[PDB]
Amino acid sequence: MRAVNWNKKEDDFSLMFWKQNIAQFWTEEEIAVSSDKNTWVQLSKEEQIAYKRVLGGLTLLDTKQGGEGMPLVLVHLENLQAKSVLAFMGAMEEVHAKSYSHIFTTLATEEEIDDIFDWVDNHPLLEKKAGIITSYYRRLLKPEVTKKELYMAMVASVFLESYLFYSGFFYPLYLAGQGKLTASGEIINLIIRDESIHGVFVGILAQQIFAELSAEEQQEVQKETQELLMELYEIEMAYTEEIYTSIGLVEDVNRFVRYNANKGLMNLGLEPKFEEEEINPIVLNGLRTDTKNHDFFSV
C-alpha cells in the first residue's frame, strides 16, 4: 500500500494549495462580534429575519460540505497529495459552520436560535437544494466508483463552493458594505477567502478527470453539467424570492447569483452562461476588509 511522499510531486498544484490552506488558517475566537449589537438593533424586523435565515442556510451547506462533500470525494482519489488538501479543506468547512454559531450567540437568544435551526431543518427549498448536491456525493458510498461519477461529484462540489453559497453571502456583505454588522462581515470574508480557493482546487481536479474520460462520456457529463447548473438556478430564484422579497433586494441578489455562477463555470474550465454585469458596488465594499490580510505564517 502507498504512503504519501511529499518529496516527489504527484501533481503541479497540491503543494501550492496545501501551503495556502494553512497560511489562511483561522478560528472564530480571533474575531469578537459583540460590538455588532450596536448596529443590529438598528435593523428592521424583516432585515433581522433575512439575516438569520441566510446564516442558517449557510450553516446547512457548510455542514454537508464538511461532513459529506469533502470526505466522500477524497476517499476515492488516488492522488495522495490532493487527498491531503481536501482533508484540510473539509476541516475548515467545520470551522466555517461553527463560526456562524459564534455570530448567532451575539445576535439572538437561545430560543431564537433553536427556531432558526428548526426552520432550516424543515424548509422544503433548502431540503431540495441540499438534496440535489448531496445525491452526487452519496453515489460515492460504494467501494468502486467510475470516473464519470467522480467527475460529477466534483462538479456538484464546485457549484456549491463557487455558486450556491453566494445567495447567502450576499446579505452579510451588503450590510457590511454599509457599515452594518462589520464584525460578522469580517468572519464572512474569511469564509469567502477559503471557499474561493476551495472552488479553484476542486475545479482543477475535475478538469484532470475530464481529460481521462472517453469522448462519449465527455459529451454526457457536459450535458449533465449544463442541466445541473440550470436546475440549481431555478431553485436559487425561488430561494431568493422567498428570502429577499420583504426587503426589496431580489433583483440585486439574482444578479449576484449569476455573476458567481459564471465564476463557478470558469473554475471548471467552461465558458460563462450568463450575461456579464457589474458586481453590486456596496457588496464590493463589503469585501474590503483588513482582516483578510492575515497570514498565519508571518505571525
Binding site: 495556502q20 497560511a23 465564476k263
Partner: protein
Amino acid sequence: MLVAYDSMTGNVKRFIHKLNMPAVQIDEDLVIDEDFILITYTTGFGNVPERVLDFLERNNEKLKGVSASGNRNWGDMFGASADKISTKYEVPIVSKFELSGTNNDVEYFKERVREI
C-alpha cells in the same frame, strides 16, 4: 506591442486568446528585446508569481505596462500583483480583470494599450 504573460490554471491564457495580439508565455530563459505589456495572475495575499518576478529581473527595461488577472473575492488584494509591479518598475497599471475577463475587459485593455 508584444504581450508577455504567465498562467497557472488557464484563465490568463484564455484571456490572451481573446486579444488577437501577438503573445508569448514567459519561462525562466525568455529574453524579450521589444516593448511589451505584461499580464500576470495574482497569487495568495495579492502577490506576484515567482516566475514573473524572475522574468522581470532580466526584462524590466522593455516593460511598458502591466495587467493582472485576479478575483474580487480578495477585496483590496484583488489583482494587487499589478500594484507591486507598477510601483517597483514605475510603469502604469493597464487594467485589472477577474479570471478570464469580460468582453468589456478585453476592449478596455486594447483601448488602454493604444493609449500607451
